[PDB]
Amino acid sequence: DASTKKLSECLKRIGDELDSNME
Amino acid sequence: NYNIEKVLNVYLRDLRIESLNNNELEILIMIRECCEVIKKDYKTEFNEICNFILQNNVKSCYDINDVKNIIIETINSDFRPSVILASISLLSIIIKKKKDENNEVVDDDLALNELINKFSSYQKDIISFVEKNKK
């Protein structure tokens, strides 16, 4: 789960940046 | 009236576009346009992700099996329409980087297929997201 959580977070942040941009 | 799973199979699995009806074609256009912006705006961050998985693959190849478990786990923990499109965009980048940079072969039909099955449950949200960004 170590490596998994770091990459999920990078991905989750891309979603946050997307919502902020388009709202 | 429409089926998202083929639309994703066209976008990701190079399925012939002629399998789509009018709605599914319109949906494809919206997904293509939305994901291209995500790929452009966040080109740097995706590469950091893609470059990371590359050094952690035993064969030094892009393999969707590596990123398979990560995406499905990410979606359940985080179910926003945006997190889905980031996955499709990341996956789309891996597919071409796979095609353009892999010196060896990789079998990930099953991996990718499972991923597209996940995106299709959340199709209702995807259509909403891509449709809004059409404006």
CB of B70 less than 8 A from some CB of A: yes
Report how far apart the first and last C-alpha atoms of chain A are (Å, whole number): 32
Give the torsion sign (CA, B18, B19, B21, B24).
Answer: negative
Domain span holding position B55 = 4-134
Which residue of chain B comes nearest to A13, CA vs CA? B83
Phi and psi at B99, nearest 5°, equal -65, -35
B18/B127 Cα distance (integer angstroms): 20
Nearest beta carbon to residue A14 from set B52, B69, B86: B86
What whole-number distance in Å separates Cα of residue B114 and Cα of residue B116? 6
How many whole angstroms separate alpha carbon B80 and alpha carbon B130?
13
Nearest Cα of chain A lies from the Cα of B77 at a distance, in angstroms, of 10
Report residue B105: phi and psi, to 5°: -100, 155
| CATH number reported for the structural domain that contains residue B41 in this entry | 1.10.437.10
CA angle B93, B99, B100 (to 5 degrees): 90
Contact A18 B86 (CB under 8 A): yes
Amino acid of residue A17? E
Domain count for chain B: 1
Asked if B82 is an interface residue toward chain A (Cβ–Cβ < 8 A), one would say yes
Q: A14 and B42 in contact by Cβ < 8 A?
A: yes
Question: Which approach determined this entry?
Answer: X-ray
- The residue behind tokens 């499972």 is B114
Q: Is B11 helix (H, G, I), strand (E, B) or coil?
A: helix
Q: At which residue do the structure tokens 């940046």 appear? A: A17
Strand, helix or coil for residue B109: helix
Stated resolution in angstroms? 2.9
